[PDB]
Design an enzyme around this catalytic site. Structure first.
Site, PDB file in Angstrom:
ATOM      1  N   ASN A  75      18.828   9.492 -11.446  1.00  0.00           N
ATOM      2  CA  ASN A  75      18.219   8.674 -10.416  1.00  0.00           C
ATOM      3  C   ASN A  75      19.431   7.687  -9.847  1.00  0.00           C
ATOM      4  OD1 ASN A  75      17.017   7.048  -8.659  1.00  0.00           O
ATOM      5  ND2 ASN A  75      14.970   6.941  -9.695  1.00  0.00           N
ATOM      6  N   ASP A  76      19.433   6.666 -10.305  1.00  0.00           N
ATOM      7  CA  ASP A  76      20.447   5.310 -10.065  1.00  0.00           C
ATOM      8  C   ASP A  76      21.838   6.142  -9.750  1.00  0.00           C
ATOM      9  OD1 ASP A  76      18.492   3.327 -10.228  1.00  0.00           O
ATOM     10  OD2 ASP A  76      19.360   2.562 -12.312  1.00  0.00           O
ATOM     11  N   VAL A  77      22.300   6.910 -10.669  1.00  0.00           N
ATOM     12  CA  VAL A  77      23.675   7.626 -10.769  1.00  0.00           C
ATOM     13  C   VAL A  77      24.079   8.336  -9.172  1.00  0.00           C
ATOM     14  CG1 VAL A  77      24.382   9.709 -11.651  1.00  0.00           C
ATOM     15  CG2 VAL A  77      24.114   7.752 -13.181  1.00  0.00           C
TER      16      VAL A  77
END
Ligand SMILES: NC(=O)c1ccc[n+]([C@@H]2O[C@H](COP(=O)([O-])OP(=O)(O)OC[C@H]3O[C@@H](n4cnc5c(N)ncnc54)[C@H](OP(=O)(O)O)[C@@H]3O)[C@@H](O)[C@H]2O)c1
Ligand SMILES: NC(=O)c1ccc[n+]([C@@H]2O[C@H](COP(=O)([O-])OP(=O)(O)OC[C@H]3O[C@@H](n4cnc5c(N)ncnc54)[C@H](O)[C@@H]3O)[C@@H](O)[C@H]2O)c1
Ligand SMILES: NC(=O)c1ccc[n+]([C@@H]2O[C@H](COP(=O)([O-])OP(=O)(O)OC[C@H]3O[C@@H](n4cnc5c(N)ncnc54)[C@H](O)[C@@H]3O)[C@@H](O)[C@H]2O)c1
EC number: 7.1.1.1
Lengths: 174, 358, 360
Positions: A102-104
């Site tokens: 996700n964040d990546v």
């Protein structure tokens, strides 16, 4: 706002693709979905598809998190690429198969300058023809922020457990 | 400007604050880069490999540091009060970037201040997403986690993996990791891939998910301290116990009392990674393997240095990542912005006066 | 009938020819079992755990052996000429089963021959399917393979696995395994578990399939081969040896010295901080720079040459040695008579029996 697909939808998209770059994250580790994932890739590349893995330097919750798990799942080292040498390949990828990340991927690292994730280098999954995100819900990642990539034209939300959902996608591939 | 990297003089420090890949970048930003001869020998980096990347090799430490505008080292420089005055070698008004341990080593802070040096304590890097590439606490701890498992297996008189053979079956090793920060998660992973059954415990609740994401089992279950009986139940079955729990500035928590170690099976080993801060086990002694009640309690100091050949490139990268956004065009000079949280949270003294709140 | 098992007195030997499980099957076989006090200390086998299997403990080595109709030792018993005379403690006309090292230790064979002792040298077990469960070279060398990698990784200053990190990529160690035998196969397995890239080579073509199934890649290039082959081999090996981080040599040839596979000039080409583990060091080494019982450092390369490597895994090595012995001995106890009769036509018995009742 947010189109949702099923195992069978994601099967059609990747079976009718020339290039797929897998993108694992914490979610993959939590569900322990490496083995199902690597099986998906080797039935994917049995179909003549070209398959890579794109590892973000801070995927998971430790250094080398994705690496140990892909290694236990018998993923060849020659298929696994670091952010800096694979970020330009996304342009020419039909699918970016995002599993538990996700964040990546969140491009608020590039855009929104008040964001907690600002300045971080990210994987350019938006540049792929279409992005498949696997996660249980609409919750954030570690960073506590929403991912704009979720509710946009060429993205697809696959709502379930990463191990179960991948298993189910391998089933529909025959 | 000029930037210089000495050899680490502290006893047992095999690391160095450079690598060939990083030298190539520093020249590319406009630096003449000097390093002291023999500095990379602990990290399997020769002076031949450094020279080829664009670096000049000074002959002594003082020569390397004399006209250096920036200085990089791994551990804080020594003072005259410890017998070797390395701060005296650093040029007046220069910049020092290193693991200073500034919040607990006020003498080195003040000795730098007198010489009007700007020092940037790398350990005080702010915990934000874009600072991950600058973060030496995680890069170095991660390797110590790996190495803990390697030292445990070295000391252990059985094989980690289960072995089914013609002569019979020997069971796998059981490993119990106390503390599940970066080091303990890499310990869990390395014990796991070697075939051990791996358990872990940590007082933070949201750690359970983490532990299972590497294939380990979390030790689950007024006075909820019957949790101690759940730990004691596994520890009694455990071969290698690896304890990784620290608290910055304070002594380490005691997680395995002498009382618990008496109930442990013979041939067991405890690897105390918290030994420099007093140990998670009070029987552990810095720099040695004490034996008592049949259990080897291992307490090596400076564990990242027991993996110095990979530890050093990563450290050097952290330093370059911290410094690179601050180099600009103007006849090769670095200009540190106060606005940058990564600079103000890390800076400790600036031109004659201490600047950090603590 | 009594069987006894002493502590091992030779320097560095932590193994023991016994385990609780084996005591139990021996009691049910008809033996009373005596074991020296503290004989299991280095294998993490306690006296209380030997007692619950049904053995008795003797206070001293002499007391264990004095009425024993059969003795089980790990290593060959010392002579007067070495220090303490253990042969002398064994009762007249008893039977002795151990790693006697009989072909290269003639003074121990003549010391036993004089006390009328029958000795069966386990290490001369004939190599046949049905004797695999009796084989001590196999059980012990397998463990030595695992330990070779653990000793590599400890001496090595980098980590084994690949790790993509916020501060760059720690690349994977590259490991190269001369000799892919029992110990060869276990070092590959264990190096692979830790996330290395693993090269291997051998003079035997059947070994290629075994390497590829463990995840190694085989290097295309047991009896004495000659000097011409050693050259083709060194040249073929050189590309990989030059990027190799750890190198484990395991090659042995029956009778003859250990084959030189990494000469002085080859090590001269390896990266600094590289490591060589020479398991064949007690036989002259695959690497001539290795010296038994120490770590040589030369040209930036650490040549490691520990002795009795199986004893560095003594807690696993012990229970498996004792099962080798139990498997060798069980077929020759007749049902309810309390006697030992070794068939003699049985090649298990003939190929391993060195002396018996006064004569060789
Ligand atoms: N790697 C390190 O050294 C380290 C250390 C500290 C912090 N971090 C931080 O952690 C983050 C890592 O990023 P990431 O993209 O890998 O992960 P992430 O940003 O935290 O997102 C992971 C996603 O996986 C999903 N997930 C959780 N369990 C799942 C399951 N069982 N099945 C399917 N999906 C599941 C979650 O949503 P759902 O619950 O809705 O499914 C979540 O959105 C970064 O922000 C990094 O800064 C990393
Ligand atoms: O990430 P990181 O590398 O910065 O972690 P860290 O370096 O801060 O230390 C290891 C972990 O141990 C935990 N801990 C503190 N006291 C403990 C105790 N009594 N028992 C078990 N765990 C304890 C900490 O919260 C910490 O995450
Ligand atoms: N009871 C039995 O049937 C029994 C018992 C033991 C071993 N074996 C078999 O014998 C084989 C050898 O095992 P081992 O470990 O006893 O062998 P070993 O210990 O005697 O030698 C180790 C290896 O080194 C190799 N080697 C020798 N010279 C070499 C050279 N110049 N270059 C490259 N490699 C060289 C050999 O081919 C051998 O595989 C195995 O495949 C095993 O299955 C069978």
């Amino acid at each position: 706002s947010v189109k949702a697909g099923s195992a069978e939808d994601a099967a059609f998209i990747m079976k009718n693709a020339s290039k797929v770059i897998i993108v694992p994250g914490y979610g993959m580790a939590v569900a322990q979905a490496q083995h199902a994932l690597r099986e998906m890739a080797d039935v994917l590349k049995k179909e003549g598809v070209e398959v890579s893995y794109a590892i973000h330097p801070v995927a998971g919750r430790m250094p080398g998190h994705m690496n140990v798990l892909l290694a236990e799942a018998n993923v060849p080292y020659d298929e696994v690429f670091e952010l800096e040498e694979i970020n330009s390949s996304f342009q020419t990828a039909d699918v970016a198969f995002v599993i538990g990340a996700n964040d990546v991927t969140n491009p608020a690292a590039k855009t929104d300058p008040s964001s907690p994730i600002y300045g971080m280098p990210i994987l350019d999954v938006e540049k792929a023809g279409t992005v498949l995100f696997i996660k249980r819900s609409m919750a954030s990642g570690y960073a506590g922020v929403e991912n704009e990539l979720f509710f946009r034209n060429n993205t697809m939300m696959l709502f379930g457990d990463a191990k179960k959902m991948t298993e189910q996608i391998v089933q529909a591939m025959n | 400007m000029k930037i210089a990297i000495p050899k680490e003089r502290r006893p047992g420090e095999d690391r160095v604050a450079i690598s060939p890949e990083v030298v190539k970048k520093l020249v590319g930003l406009g630096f003449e880069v000097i390093v002291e001869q023999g500095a990379g020998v602990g990290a399997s980096i020769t002076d031949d490999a450094l020279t080829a990347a664009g670096a000049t090799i000074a002959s002594t430490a003082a020569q390397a540091l004399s006209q250096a505008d920036v200085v990089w080292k791994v551990q804080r420089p020594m003072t005259a009060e410890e017998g070797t005055d390395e701060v005296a070698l650093i040029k007046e008004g220069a910049v020092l970037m290193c693991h200073l341990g500034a919040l607990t080593n006020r003498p080195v802070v003040e000795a730098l201040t007198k010489r009007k040096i700007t020092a940037y304590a790398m350990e005080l890097m702010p915990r934000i997403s874009r600072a991950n590439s600058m973060d030496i606490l995680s890069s170095q701890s991660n390797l110590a986690g790996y190495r803990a498992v390697i030292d445990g297996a070295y000391e252990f008189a059985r094989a980690f993996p289960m072995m089914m053979t013609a002569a019979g079956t020997v069971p796998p090793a059981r490993v119990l990791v106390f503390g599940v920060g970066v080091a303990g998660l890499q310990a869990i992973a390395t014990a796991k891939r070697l075939g051990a059954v791996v358990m872990a415990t940590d007082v933070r609740a949201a750690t359970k998910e983490q532990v299972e994401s590497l294939g380990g089992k979390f030790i689950t279950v007024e006075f909820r301290k019957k949790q101690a009986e759940a730990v004691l139940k596994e520890l009694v079955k455990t071969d290698i116990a690896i304890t990784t729990a620290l608290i910055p500035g304070k002594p380490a928590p005691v997680l395995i009392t002498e009382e618990m170690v008496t109930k442990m099976k013979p041939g067991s080993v405890i690897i105390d990674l918290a030994v420099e801060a007093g140990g998670n086990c009070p029987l552990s002694e810095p720099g040695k393997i004490v034996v008592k009640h049949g259990v080897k309690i291992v307490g090596h100091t400076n564990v990242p240095s027991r993996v110095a050949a990979d530890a050093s490139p990563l450290f050097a990268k952290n330093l370059l990542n911290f410094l690179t956004p601050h180099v600009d065009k103007d006849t090769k000079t670095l200009v540190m912005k106060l606005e940058d949280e990564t600079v103000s949270g890390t800076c400790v003294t600036r031109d004659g006066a201490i600047v950090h709140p603590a």
